[PDB]
Design a protein around this nucleic acid. Structure first.
Lengths: 181, 163, 85, 73, 217
RNA sequence: AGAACUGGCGAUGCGGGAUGCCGAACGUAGAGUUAAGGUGCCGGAAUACACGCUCAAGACAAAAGGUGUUAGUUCAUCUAGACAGCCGGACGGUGCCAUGGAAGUCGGAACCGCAGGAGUGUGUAACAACUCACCGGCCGAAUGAACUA
RNA sequence: AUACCGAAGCAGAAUUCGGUAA
């Protein structure tokens, strides 16, 4: 089709304010601030009334429209994280070898393995062992990408060593996803 | 640079009439003779071209959404095709169609037949989005990444592409 | 199924012994595969049955007749389920 | 060792907590793997893949035709 | 490129409803416009079996609008545009011959148990026991109640979000969890503590075209 | 693998194709225009203009596939609400053989009362529970299937 | 030439298959 013009709109809650120069995101709100570089996408931002930012692409195509829509998706995710804040919950179980998670995140005694597993804490993500709930860890952070990457790394670096995939139930999984608010 | 000519024939009657687009009258006559065989059974020696006259646009100062029906002989037979083109004159509209066909289908003057060209004076009649997008109310769009033909071999300012 | 597998092996040996015994040479090799496929593909049903029985026979318990053994019989689930437990 | 040892354990403790989500995502990725593989596999791999895809297309067409028959009568 | 035992009804079904409404506009003696709170096939069949002189006609709301007229200047009869505009929500349109006094009583006197609906809090503060869960809910008399199936726990932990876990084939929770998830939780346990009472608005006459607007449940 | 024939060498320069068909057939010289073939450098000539294509090509394999990219053809839906996506209805008689459990969903043989299969899958010993296809609250117009290139 | 991935009713041991690679 080769659309001559295409644009989308981003909702801006009163609690947050944004300013974009040279494709630089500056999301500021009650839960802190976040930034991201979108220069490689070559999209254009346009303010209208300090409450809605237009992201538009001219003479683009499906390849460029995909990046344009991804820009809006990332902006919405950043706004939600700065406002509500994401809370990734992860639960771990053990058939016969307790997983003595300890602090930096460390994992011990997985399937009786002597080796110690650990994943460094990333920026913008916090770790809080679940209270009262048995063998549960609750993660939180304004940046969805960092929290999700930390959860994926924790779930991947601790896996069965090429044994039966059904008999061995030990592991760590994302039990629930929610928001801080 | 094509030109529009009206060519008629009658094999020396019904006075068959059709519109031919060619760069010159000589090519127009040849195309008319070729189309005569397809339309009916006639030969060049049968008669003579009764009259050939170039047709100029009534007013080459108005933008018209030309609707064109074109049949072309592809590598696997001939198929009927219809398209709409936004232009100012029929001569330019047909040339644009020829260039588009040569760019995509690689069909050229040899294997392209022009059936009918008619303007569209009402919106929503054009069913092609690439023309429909230009039929809206006065719009505005930029021209990003503009460039300048630097005659000098060397530059000292690091030119910018802004418009 | 065992008889069918034995017959297939015998036919494979027969085909091999038959061969043991440019334009023209190109077609020499085709017949070997063309007939091996005919011999083999038809055994899918016996092979399917063999595979089906393999899973069931690969988990049989240790029903040792020599060692002293005790059995329980009667109407199902009259408390018998927990007796062995 | 029992007749349903793996099934017994699965029923007694359930499947892997992420098996369903991973399986759904694995099938979603396989949905694009069909096109991804056909544009890179060379030689014997491509030769087999083309024939298998043609067979699947023919089988799918026959299945659709049979389904249409079950609706007529 | 790059895209994602019965057949589609098509325009024929819509025309069928249109013709049925057009015929029933004068076939019956009286008409009512309904706003039933929910759709429930057992209840919608009990409403039919409860009487013989009245029938409930259901269809697409916009299809009913065409049959009754989308504009007052094109209505086939007086107050038909008002009748078409009155219908809303569930496309309930009742036809009856009994007088208004007899018909109105059924709506008030008729009520049946039903599940909750989205955007509505649970009718009661039902709580699952802080231990081994049961199919019926657990908090209900445990003598009849039975432990839940082992294979359904993944759906509960995801669709319902409750922190259920399988232990030796039985689901168990460490806390007494309370009750669209609000309606789904009640639906799964079968706790239909809510009730459904079809409400009606303007009673209509096929000749007088009276608009007896009301709101009896 | 012989073959009845029509243009060309043998005796054939020169320009072009890195080198082996196109142009052109030849005295020694000065001046101007071209054929073939070229105009990013080697290489004498415009990193010339205009319409689209292509992410790895580009100066015998085409039998077939691509959720690779861009255009037209047939049918269908038409603000009586296009397509994607949320919530609900998804019922009744009800079924016989396997009897051990099988009630749509392990396997025998194919109705209809009023938007709904005597049933596309998940799953339980089987009911249970979700479901797609079919509709309804739902959204506000292009869209789904196969072909031509 | 050795190993790294995904699958098998692969409980463990142990075995086979599609890709990387000599």
């Amino acid at each position: 089709m080769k659309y001559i013009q295409t644009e989308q709109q981003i909702e801006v809650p009163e609690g947050v304010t944004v300013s974009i120069k040279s494709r630089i995101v500056k999301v500021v709100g009650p839960r802190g601030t976040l930034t991201k570089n979108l220069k490689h996408i070559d999209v254009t931002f346009t303010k209208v009334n300090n409450q809605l930012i237009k992201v538009a692409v001219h003479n683009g195509g499906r390849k460029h429209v995909a990046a344009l829509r991804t820009v809006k998706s990332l902006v919405d995710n950043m706004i939600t994280g700065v406002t509500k804040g994401y809370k990734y919950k992860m639960r771990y179980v053990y058939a016969h070898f307790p997983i003595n998670v300890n602090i930096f995140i460390e994992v011990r005694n997985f399937l009786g393995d002597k080796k110690i597993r650990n994943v460094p804490v990333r920026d913008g993500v916090t770790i809080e062992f679940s209270t009262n709930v048995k063998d549960e860890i609750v993660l939180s952070g304004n940046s969805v990408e960092d929290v999700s990457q930390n959860a994926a790394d924790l779930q991947q670096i601790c896996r069965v060593r090429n044994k039966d995939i059904r008999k061995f139930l030990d592991g760590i999984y994302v039990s629930h996803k929610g928001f801080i608010t | 640079h094509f030109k529009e000519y009206q060519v008629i024939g009658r094999r020396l009657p019904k006075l068959f009439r059709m519109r031919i687009f060619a760069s010159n009258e000589v090519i127009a006559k040849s195309r008319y003779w070729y189309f005569l065989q397809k339309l009916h059974k006639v030969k060049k020696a049968s008669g003579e071209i009764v009259s050939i006259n170039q047709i100029n646009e009534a007013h080459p100062t108005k933008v018209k959404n030309f609707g064109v029906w074109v049949r072309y002989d592809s590598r696997s037979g001939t198929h009927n095709m219809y398209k709409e083109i936004r232009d100012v004159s029929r001569v330019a509209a047909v040339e644009t169609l020829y260039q588009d066909m040569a760019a995509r289908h690689r069909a050229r003057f040899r294997s392209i037949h022009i059936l009918k060209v008619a303007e569209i004076e009402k919106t929503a009649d054009v069913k092609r989005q690439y023309v429909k997008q230009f039929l809206t109310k006065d719009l505005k769009f930029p021209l990003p990444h503009r460039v300048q033909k630097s005659t000098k071999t060397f530059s000292y300012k690091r030119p910018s592409t802004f418009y | 199924s065992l008889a069918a597998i034995s017959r297939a092996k015998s036919l494979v040996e027969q085909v091999a012994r038959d061969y043991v015994r440019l334009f023209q040479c190109k077609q020499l090799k085709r017949a070997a595969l063309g007939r091996m496929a005919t011999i083999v593909k038809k055994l899918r049903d016996p092979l399917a049955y063999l595979e089906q029985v393999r899973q069931h026979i690969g988990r049989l318990p240790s029903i040792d007749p020599n060692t002293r053994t005790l059995l329980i019989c009667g109407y199902p689930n009259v408390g018998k389920s927990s007796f062995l437990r | 060792p029992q007749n349903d040892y793996i099934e017994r354990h699965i029923k007694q403790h359930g499947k892997r907590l992420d098996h369903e989500e991973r399986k759904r995502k694995r099938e979603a990725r396989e949905s694009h793997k069909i096109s991804e593989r056909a544009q890179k596999l060379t030689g014997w791999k491509g030769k087999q893949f083309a024939k298998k895809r043609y067979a699947e297309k023919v089988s799918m067409r026959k299945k659709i035709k049979a389904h249409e028959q079950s609706k007529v009568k | 490129r790059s895209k994602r035992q019965t057949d589609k009804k098509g325009r024929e079904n819509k025309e069928r409803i249109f013709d049925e409404v057009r015929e029933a506009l004068d076939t019956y003696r009286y008409v009512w416009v309904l706003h039933l709170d929910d759709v429930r096939t057992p209840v919608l069949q009990e409403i039919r079996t409860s009487w013989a002189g009245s029938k409930l006609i259901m269809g697409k709301r916009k299809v009913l609008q065409k049959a009754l007229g989308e504009k007052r200047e094109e209505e086939y009869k007086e107050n038909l545009y008002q009748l078409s505009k009155l219908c809303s929500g569930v496309t309930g349109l009742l036809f009856t011959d009994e007088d208004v006094n007899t018909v109105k009583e059924y709506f008030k006197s008729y009520v049946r148990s039903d599940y909750s609906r989205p955007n509505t809090k649970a009718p009661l503060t039902f709580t699952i026991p802080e231990g081994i869960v049961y199919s019926r809910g657990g908090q209900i008399p445990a003598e009849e109640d039975v432990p839940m199936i082992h294979s359904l726990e993944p759906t509960m932990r995801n669709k319902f979000e409750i922190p259920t876990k399988i232990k030796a084939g039985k689901i168990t929770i460490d806390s007494p969890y309370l009750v669209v998830r609000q309606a789904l939780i009640l639906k799964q346990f079968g706790i239909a503590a809510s009730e459904f009472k079809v409400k009606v608005s303007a009673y209509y006459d096929n000749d007088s075209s009276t608009v007896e607007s009301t709101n009896i449940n």
